[PDB]
Amino acid sequence: MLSPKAATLAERSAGLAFSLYQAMAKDQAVENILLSPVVVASSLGLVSLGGKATTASQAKAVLSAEQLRDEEVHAGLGELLRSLSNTWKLGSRLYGPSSVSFAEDFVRSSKQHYNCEHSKINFRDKRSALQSINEWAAQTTDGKLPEVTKDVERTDGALLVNAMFFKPHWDEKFHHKMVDNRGFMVTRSYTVGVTMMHRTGLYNYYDDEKEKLQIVEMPLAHKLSSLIILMPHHVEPLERLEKLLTKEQLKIWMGKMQKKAVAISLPKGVVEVTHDLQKHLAGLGLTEAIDKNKADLSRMSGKKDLYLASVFHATAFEWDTEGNPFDQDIYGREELRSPKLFYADHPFIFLVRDTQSGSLLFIGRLVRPKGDKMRDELLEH
């Protein structure tokens, strides 16, 4: 269980994730979203630890922890991260330019609370500078996230990179052979070739006929956490559902659910997402760190114009059939008679909520999965 200072930070990290998710939803270039509230909070905590006066106070104000000591904030955020690492790989690394040399005071404290790694990099040889970042990201997730970024835009400051891999292990596993190729409609006309996993069981379900959407709670291993999926009735951009997505509406929808027979069909595969949160973090409040001329990262190194060039938040979310074994031949002869069809073959939103602490672990959407495009085909069966 989390401490009281950590619990209030966790409460704010969840709200900060909805705030950041909404900002990214409005971006037209953004397709798939994947944010871990705790890892996003850790990024701001590292800016409060390395920054000073305006740069540091902005990070605490974004985290609503301005009315707390720096030592309380760093111990509180370090405590959140320790409750994640208990199917889940995470590494943080600060990449400063070749000339820049990190302070021993900062390196000791960041590795203690946030478990931050440090590495200098020469951006002149871009083919080798990008290689070094992508190799570290691949080694952190054991190949599950090979390339994080194809090009680094701001090559004159500090670059925080957060590499992640999360594979939700189900409470009731899907059968390994209940997998077949189906088409995922990105838009009404556009469709991609995907592999799909299917299972029918008992899940907390609510079909909002007024708002035209479906919501299902899929528990993960030993019901410690659960994966909630919100999806519209028909193929449409998620902008409509995203407006209705709030922390309090979600609580309302979860109360309206009931354990019903659901025939769930999800897309099996790995979803790689890289987000340079630097531009979106400026909108939330941190404008001094992102600015080249106003950044005060003096406690981090003691370098003139050392600014937060980029905040990469790369994730590899794996949808797989693996899970705990369900009791075969259970009392479901008439229970699974007419299951509700949750056929996820079009864009949907998902959340990984902790059951006991209530803290949000992940938030995102699947708009365009990894797959080939289709096509000038009118060939009927």
Automatic annotation (TrEMBL):
Keywords attached to this entry: Acetylation, Chaperone, Collagen, Endoplasmic reticulum, Glycoprotein, Phosphoprotein, Signal, Stress response
Highest taxon, organism lineage: Eukaryota
Residue span(s) of domain Serpin: 18-369
GO molecular function: collagen binding; serine-type endopeptidase inhibitor activity
Record carries keyword Chaperone: yes
InterPro entries for this protein: Serpin_CS, Serpin_dom, Serpin_fam, Serpin_H1_serpin_dom, Serpin_sf, Serpin_sf_1, Serpin_sf_2
Broad class of where this protein is predominantly found: endoplasmic reticulum
SMART domains membership: SERPIN (SM00093)
Any one of the GO CC terms: extracellular space
Gene3D superfamilies: Alpha-1-antitrypsin, domain 1 (2.30.39.10), Antithrombin, subunit I, domain 2 (3.30.497.10)
SUPFAM superfamilies: Serpins
Localization per record: Endoplasmic reticulum lumen
Protein purpose: Binds specifically to collagen. Could be involved as a chaperone in the biosynthetic pathway of collagen.
Family: Belongs to the serpin family.
Descriptive protein name: Serpin H1
